[PDB]
C-alpha cells in the first residue's frame, strides 16, 4: 500500500477491477468512459466502449438505437433518411418526403 489505489478523480477505491492511469493518475473505469464517452442521441447517456458504439457522420449511436421509425428495422451501415429527430428507410422516407 506504499502508493495510493483510488480513482484520483472520484477518489473512490477502484472497484474490484483493473484501472487506467489518466492524467498520470488512477481514474475509475467509468471516469475514462463517461469523460470521453460519446452521447447516444437516442438514450442521451454516454456510450461506453463496453458496448457496440455505432459511429456515423461524426455522430454516435447504440447499434441497437439506430433504427427506422416505421419498420423499427436496425439501420446500420445501411442507407437511411436522416429526419430532424427520426431515421427512416429511403423507402419509407420517400413515402412521406414526397
Ligand atoms: Zn472516477
Ligand atoms: Zn442508445
Ligand atoms: Zn422504414
Amino acid at each position: 500500500m506504499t502508493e495510493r489505489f483510488d480513482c484520483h478523480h472520484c477518489n473512490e477505491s477502484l472497484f474490484g477491477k483493473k484501472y487506467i492511469l489518466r492524467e498520470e493518475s488512477p481514474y475509475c473505469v467509468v471516469c475514462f468512459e463517461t469523460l470521453f464517452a460519446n452521447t447516444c442521441e437516442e438514450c442521451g447517456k454516454p456510450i461506453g466502449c463496453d458496448c457496440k458504439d455505432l459511429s456515423y457522420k461524426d455522430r454516435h449511436w447504440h447499434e441497437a438505437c439506430f433504427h427506422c421509425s416505421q419498420c423499427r428495422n436496425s439501420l446500420v451501415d445501411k442507407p437511411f433518411a436522416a429526419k430532424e429527430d427520426q431515421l427512416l428507410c429511403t423507402d419509407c422516407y420517400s413515402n412521406e418526403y414526397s
Side-chain angles (χ1 to χ4, degrees):
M1 283 285 220
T2 183
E3 67 197 328
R4 300 286 227 313
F5 207 75
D6 317 61
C7 165
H8 195 104
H9 174 357
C10 314
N11 172 252
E12 70 192 345
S13 162
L14 288 299
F15 58 103
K17 178 160 268 66
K18 296 100 82 197
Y19 65 107
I20 297 156
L21 289 292
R22 180 64 224 316
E23 285 191 14
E24 64 168 42
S25 324
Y27 269 19
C28 59
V29 195
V30 195
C31 266
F32 189 101
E33 314 210 301
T34 209
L35 293 164
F36 326 138
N38 283 111
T39 319
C40 163
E41 304 175 68
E42 203 297 323
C43 304
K45 307 195 87 181
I47 310 179
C49 193
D50 181 72
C51 308
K52 313 300 197 296
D53 60 327
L54 216 219
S55 73
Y56 204 108
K57 190 172 184 54
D58 190 81
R59 290 165 184 165
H60 290 80
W61 266 298
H62 284 116
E63 200 278 359
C65 282
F66 209 121
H67 51 265
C68 166
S69 199
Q70 309 282 305
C71 321
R72 316 183 299 300
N73 282 134
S74 295
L75 315 156
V76 167
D77 175 31
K78 271 171 77 170
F80 58 77
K83 171 159 166 285
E84 286 172 50
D85 273 288
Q86 312 283 21
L87 278 154
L88 290 153
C89 314
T90 155
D91 292 51
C92 322
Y93 192 74
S94 309
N95 195 119
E96 39 162 281
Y97 174 74
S98 290

